Amino acid sequence: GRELSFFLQAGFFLGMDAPAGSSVACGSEVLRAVPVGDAAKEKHIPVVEVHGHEVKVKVGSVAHPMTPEHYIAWVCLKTRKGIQLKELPVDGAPEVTFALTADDQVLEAYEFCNLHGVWSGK
Amino acid sequence: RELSFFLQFFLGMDAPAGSSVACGSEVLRAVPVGTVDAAKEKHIPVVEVHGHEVKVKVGSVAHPMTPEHYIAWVCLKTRKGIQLKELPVDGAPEVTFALTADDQVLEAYEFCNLHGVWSGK
Ligand SMILES: [Fe+3]
Ligand SMILES: [Fe+3]
Ligand SMILES: [Fe+3]
Ligand SMILES: [Mg+2]
Known part of the structure; x- marks a missing residue:
């Protein structure tokens, strides 16, 4: 299942x-x-949007807070060929994009909220 | 990190x-x-950038890829994040990663099942 x-x-x-x-x-x-991680689903389940060899992950079907007290810390992507993780700038949007090689395909996205923990989406 | x-x-x-x-x-x-007594020429990952793709070869000379002695995975550290790909044991000792345009490679790491982890830039 990888x-x-x-x-x-603190890492x-x-x-x-x-x-x-x-x-x-x-x-x-x-x-x-x-x-x-129902009521928390809207602001916490990652939405995945592929175009070509790029995968944008948005936390929010509508947007989650990005403030110092309440923020999305990072998004992790599991793909067929590997894994990626990017931390999100706290003063940016609750979204990040990953790039894939032509032979790779996305499987699952995971996001961590500092207050609400980890959530997964496809 | x-x-x-x-x-x-x-x-x-x-x-x-x-x-x-x-x-x-x-x-x-x-x-x-980088602290196993083993050949650096076969273990230190070599990093090549071609546009938004980063190819990592292990190493300057190609390391074995056999069931007994193989590169299991390569990890890439970039400005914006981390990546890890396992290598198929019956392929070549190389793998490619893709970056977003705002990103840049920093360092690569590879694990040989016998000779441990090695880094290179
Ligand atoms: Fe939250
Ligand atoms: Fe570069
Ligand atoms: Fe080795
Ligand atoms: Mg660039």
Whole structure:
């Protein structure tokens, strides 16, 4: 399934095919895989829009807040050939674009909100 | 961020020194980068940019790609983000990434199943 997990402290860890119940000891936090997240769906599920070899991800079917207290931190893209992750500038829009090689195709997008956690969309 | 690799993969972004991962019943610590006694000419990734594509070759001379001895993946750090692609074991020791026009490559990393992680620019 090439299953993605996320462990968040201040930085974070991305796991690929982490076994169930895996954890990261980092300081004395023990970090566990965060869950993926109805009423929060509108502002948090990533919308994926492909054109050619570019994939725009928008957080918001309508736009999520991008303020210092409440923001989208990053978006991760899983594709057939690999993974990508880009952090979002806190004072920009809740969107980011990734580029793919011609042989690659998108599978799933994931976004982290600093207050509401991780959400996935296709 | 500073990147670290915990290999059963897990990728760390600003992971504290001394982090460990309980990966099921395995424990993983960050692998040293460029500290295996092995040939640099076959392990240090070579990075070539062609427009919005970045081709990474492992290495200056092509590394084996056999079931026993192979490049498992290449990770790319760019100004705007990170990428990781696994390499098919029956292909060539190279892979290409695509960047948005606002992005630029910074550094590449590759893992050889026998010879660890190596970086290069
Ligand atoms: Fe939120
Ligand atoms: Fe360049
Ligand atoms: Fe090797
Ligand atoms: Mg440019």
